Amino acid sequence: NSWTKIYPPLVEHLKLQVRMNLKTKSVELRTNPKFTTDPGALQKGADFIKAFTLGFDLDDSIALLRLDDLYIETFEVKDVKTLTGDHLSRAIGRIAGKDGKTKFAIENATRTRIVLADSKIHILGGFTHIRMARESVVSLILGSPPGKVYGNLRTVASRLKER
């Protein structure tokens, strides 16, 4: 349903040859020698599709194409702490918070996007910014109460604006 807004930027601005393979269920991308001009366009398109594949919103994914210094940071809760059963589920809930609020508080403060795909976390933004987000989420996994993290999020945000 979103594809009507996916291929135009790839084909027009990046001058790339687009397709998706119904047989292999893959998005198919190529560089056109006679039209493509930017050598880095092809990897840029591939990175953008991955962001949508990981679960990020399309408009957020466009940022990968618009800007050149955006990276996606990925890790697992198991990497942080050994949580299983209800403890694991509660940790996921703590990250999201009521109505997904806590995720948005990190999101707005640290100036990134976070996709909470079950126990898999993906963070999109600038290299410093994603690290700033990554510190908040790891704290929540370990047992930090959210409203306490909300306080620290205000502090870092105050520093972001003044810089």
Binding site: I62, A63, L70, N108, R113, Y150, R154, A157
Partner: protein, 41 residues
């Protein structure tokens, strides 16, 4: 300061766009307050 706890309407390109391009809202608030006083005066 209060940090928004809901999803941001603006996309990262948009806020990045905003950064590329003391407070106008603060001067707006002065304008009505002056307007209210002029009417009240």
């Amino acid at each position: 300061f209060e940090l928004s706890d809901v999803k941001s309407s603006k996309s990262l390109a948009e806020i990045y766009e905003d950064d590329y391009t003391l407070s106008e809202e603060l001067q707006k608030a002065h304008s009505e307050i002056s307007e209210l006083y002029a009417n009240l005066v």
